[PDB]
């Protein structure tokens, strides 16, 4: 959607992606049409200089599972103009997952999807296991929260 999208400012902004999580991080750039584009991943505890632009939008996920992550305590990161040539830091961290979500992550990392139904757990959880994290669904959710909050 045009709501969540990068603006073609053409105004360079120096940024540093800092992975302060124990996950391999996938930076995702929202292009000019609001479509998510992947960028090189970051290993845990590593940082990297990025040449981005004022008004561009970024979000971050676990590279292998797409589990949600936060950047500077929030969902989206928007580069601003550099002051005194100081790069803008994008500190990526794990959010406090609910205990239920964390257990689902672990079970998913150990079980093949075609085997979920073989687990001796309550019926309702089968659906939860199958409803894995999805960036597209997140963008739609964020857009509703975005609009529907004014």
């Amino acid at each position: 959607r045009p709501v969540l999208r990068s603006v073609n400012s053409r105004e360079p902004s120096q940024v540093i992606f800092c992975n302060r999580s124990p996950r391999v991080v996938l930076p995702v750039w929202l292009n000019f049409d609001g479509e998510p584009q992947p960028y090189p991943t970051l290993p845990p505890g590593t940082g990297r200089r990025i040449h981005s632009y004022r008004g561009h939008l970024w979000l971050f996920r676990d590279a292998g599972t797409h589990d949600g992550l936060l950047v500077n305590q929030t969902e989206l990161f928007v580069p601003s103009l550099n002051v005194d040539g100081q790069p803008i830091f994008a500190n990526i961290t794990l959010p406090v997952y609910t205990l239920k979500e964390r257990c689902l992550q672990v079970v998913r990392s150990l079980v093949k999807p075609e085997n979920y139904r073989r687990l001796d757990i309550v019926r309702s959880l089968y659906e939860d296991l199958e409803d894995h994290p999805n960036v597209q669904k997140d963008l739609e959710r964020l857009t509703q929260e975005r609009i529907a909050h004014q």
Partner: peptide, 15 residues
């Protein structure tokens, strides 16, 4: 329309 890009540079460990 200019997109983001990564300069050839060595990553650094977060201390």
């Amino acid at each position: 329309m200019l997109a983001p890009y990564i300069p050839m540079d060595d990553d650094f460990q977060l201390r």
